[PDB]
Amino acid sequence: AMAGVYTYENEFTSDIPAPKLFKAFVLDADNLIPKIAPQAVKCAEILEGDGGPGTIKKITFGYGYVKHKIHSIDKVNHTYSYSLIEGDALSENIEKIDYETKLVSAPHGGTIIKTTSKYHTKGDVEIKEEHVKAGKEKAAHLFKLIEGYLKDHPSEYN
């Protein structure tokens, strides 16, 4: 019954400018990711809301699905936050996970992507280093694919 929050932060870099990355990775993820990784995302459907705060999305992938609830989108600052509210990473021990991502402009025109994950826990906390790392290496593979797409279609997301 003990409720708590485990917070984990991570950061990676890109040569892609922040605005373009924001438009592609963040704002057009429903459309872009199916294109470059049909297994990571087959389908995204909005179940309620506009597409801004409060929006609920169902994401189906090549098998199972998750639901995301959008908390905020700050287009001007290039920050985004949303929670995993249904899916297999959840349990009686992890009731939900909040993500917050910030795209910061690097010195030479690229980006530093900073992500905070907050696991809302119940009872004893058990969180394996190996599952956290497997999550980062999966995301990084898919991020590298997005970067490749943006470099292969330079007239997009300007």
Residue numbers in the entry: -1 to 60, 65 to 160
What does the paper say about this structure?
Fra a proteins are members of the pathogenesis-related 10 family and are required for the normal accumulation of flavonoids and the development of color in strawberry fruits. PR-10 proteins belong to the START superfamily. These proteins adopt a helix-grip fold with an internal cavity capable of binding hydrophobic ligands. The data presented here demonstrates that Fra a proteins bind natural flavonoids, providing for the first time mechanistic insight on the function of these proteins in the control of flavonoid biosynthesis.
The Fra a 1E protein crystallized in two different crystal forms. The two crystal forms belong to the same space group (P212121) but show different unit cell dimensions and molecular arrangement. Crystal form A contains two protein molecules per asymmetric unit, whereas crystal from B contains six independent copies per asymmetric unit. The refined model contained two molecules of Fra a 1E in the asymmetric unit. Both molecules showed a similar structure and comprise amino acids 2 to 160. The region corresponding to the β3-β4 loop (amino acids 61–63 and 61–65 in chains A and B, respectively) was disordered and could not be modeled. The three amino acids from the N-terminal purification tag that remain after TEV cleavage were also visible in the structure. As can be appreciated in Fig. 3a, the structure of Fra a 1E conforms to the START fold and consists of a seven-stranded β-sheet, two short helical segments between strands 5 and 7, and a long α-helix at the C terminus. The β-sheet adopts a slightly curved shape with the long C-terminal α-helix (α3) juxtaposed against the concave side, which creates a cavity in the middle of the protein. The open end of the cavity was surrounded by loops α2-β2, β3-β4, β5-β6, and β7-α3, designated here, respectively, as L3 (amino acids 35–39), L5 (amino acids 60–65), L7 (amino acids 89–96), and L9 (amino acids 125–130), and by the N-terminal half of the last α-helix (α3). A number of well ordered water molecules were found inside the cavity.
